[PDB]
Amino acid sequence: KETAAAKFERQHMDSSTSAASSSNYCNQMMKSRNLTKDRCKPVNTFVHESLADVQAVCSQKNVACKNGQTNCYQSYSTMSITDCRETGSSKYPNCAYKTTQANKHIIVACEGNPYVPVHFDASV
């Protein structure tokens, strides 16, 4: 099966652009990363930084995860992100999204040996 680390890269990493390409970005990316296959995933974040810089977050500020686990880490620096949020007109299988670009600190959950990001928790 797809590993947890590989799943994080598919769902959340987009190092090819530095910021939300266009108004069409979320529509294109949610579909191409297979996040609209079984349903319209209602919310998702993509991070526009190098893989190395995102993996380094697992050695930064330890904080509580939203689920109460203690394996979450917050980035010291801000990072370029794009939030995708399901619009009102959206109806499966024709999923539709609004694209919003921001610069925020990211919070990720880490696991494994090597210790790497496995889930995206929040941005602040």
To one decimal, the resolution in angstroms is 1.7
- Active site annotation includes 48: no
Full residue range of the structural domain in which residue 82 is found: 1-124
Annotated binding residue at 31?
Answer: no
Number of structural domains in the chain = 1
**Which string of b and e fits 53-89 if b means at least 16 CB within 10 Å?**
ebbbbbebeeeebeeeeebbbbbeeebbbbbbebeee
Annotated binding residue at 44?
Answer: yes
State yes or no: cis peptide before 114, omega within 30 of 0.
yes
Q: Nearest CA to 45 among 103, 6, 5?
A: 103
Q: Nearest CA to 80 among 20, 29, 25, 32?
A: 20
β-pairing, 61-63 with 72-74?
A: antiparallel
Three-class secondary structure assignment of the chain: CCCHHHHHHHHHECCCCCCCCCCCHHHHHHHHCCCCCCCCCCEEEEECCCHHHHHHHHHCEEECCCCCCCCEEECCCCEEEEEEEECCCCECCECCEEEEEEEECEEEEEECCCCEEEEEEEEC
Active-site annotation holder among 12, 27, 47, 121: 12
Residue 83's CATH number: 3.10.130.10
Annotated binding residue at 41?
Answer: yes
β-pairing, 72-74 with 79-86?
A: unpaired
Active-site annotation holder among 82, 97, 99, 119: 119
Annotated binding residue at 10?
Answer: yes
